[PDB]
Amino acid sequence: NAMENQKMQEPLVYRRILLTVDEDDNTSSERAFRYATTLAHDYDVPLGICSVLESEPSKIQAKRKHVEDVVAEYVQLAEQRGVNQVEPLVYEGGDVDDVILEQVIPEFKPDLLVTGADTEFPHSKIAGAIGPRLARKAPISVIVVR
Amino acid sequence: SNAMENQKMQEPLVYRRILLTVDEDDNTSSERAFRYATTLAHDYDVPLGICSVLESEDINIFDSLTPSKIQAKRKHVEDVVAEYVQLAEQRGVNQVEPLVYEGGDVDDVILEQVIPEFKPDLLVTGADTEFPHSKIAGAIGPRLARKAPISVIVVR
Ligand SMILES: [Mg+2]
Ligand SMILES: [Mg+2]
Incomplete structure (x- = not known):
């Protein structure tokens, strides 16, 4: 038929995975985490775990610590899972979508963004x-995990 | 995390039944979507279904050219799905099946017919896949x- 046989056969493995998380707990966030870390473990590829602090003082440092703590816990769990290269990616900005698209993706250079279907940021x-x-x-590529 | 939570967060997640959605166009995103779906199905030994949704003739549109146009489009999409199935078998996917459906609302056909019948846990499609009909x-x-x-992965 009409497609190029050899090209269509080449394996495809995502090389650099970005997991975006919020502070909430639900089945989609659990499964997004498990998918991203299973993929990173099974194919031995780097994982970045990102969250974003939304622009609005002991209060601001407490909010910042909270986001840092959420990401640090996910990184610890990823390490326990056996992922060889996992790093925290805490970013700050006005609109989370632009922070991810204009800062995180170009800096970390993932080829796959993973996030749970429930992940959201209130502002x-x-x-x-x-x-x-x-x-x-x-x-x-973007996978929305449920 | 408590002990139960920790264990649950550690459990491997490997999708069990993969649904690849395609149109007739051969582009970078569709190639990569096919390669991701078949690599997953091959490496993890899980079933793959390859789906498209055809346009049907409208009983209120009667003319000499429309039937040929619609029939030839249907056959083209059937050919593309059959070729993807053969390529997936060549790739070494053990369980792969065609899932050709039809209807005027493709979102609804996939959500209400294809997903409940084939029971995938992951839908894969290229970012360019579209159904103008x-x-x-x-x-x-x-x-x-x-x-x-x-879960849905939109592949680029
Ligand atoms: Mg291991
Ligand atoms: Mg069956």
Whole structure:
């Protein structure tokens, strides 16, 4: 038929994985974490775990510590899972979508963004689940995990 | 995390039943979508279904050219799905099946017919996959990522 046989056979493995997390607990966030860390473990590829502090003082440092703690806990669990290279990616900005698209993706250079279907940030310019928005707008592959 | 939570967070996640959604166009995103789905199905030994949704003839549109146009489009999409199935078998996927459906609302066909029948836990599609015949215009992947009850990867 019409497709190039050899090219269509080449394996595809994602080389640099970015997991985006919020502070909430739910089945989608658990499964997004497990997918990203299973992939990174099984194919021996780097994982970045990102969250974003939203622009609004012992209060601001407490909010910052909270985001840092959420990401640090996920990194610890990823290390326990056996992922060889995992790093925290805590970023700050006005609109989370732009922070991810304009700062995190270009700096960390992932080829896959993973996030749970429930992940959301209350002061994002567009309200609601960030995963499908990123699936539409990002220049890389995006999986929205449920 | 408490002990139970820690253990649950550690449990491997390997998708069990993969649904690849395709249109007739051969582009970078569709090639990579096919390669990701078949690499997953091969490396983890899980079933793959390869789906598309055909346009049907409209009983209120009667003319000499429309039937040929629609029939030839249907056969083209059937050919593309069959070729993807053969390529997946050549790739070494043990269980791969065609899933050709039809209807005017492709989102609804996938959500209400294909997913409940094939029972995938992951839907894969290229970022360019689109069905201009359908109710809603533009790339279907991000809409399915929003609406589906299962995980959806939009591949670029
Ligand atoms: Mg291990
Ligand atoms: Mg069956």
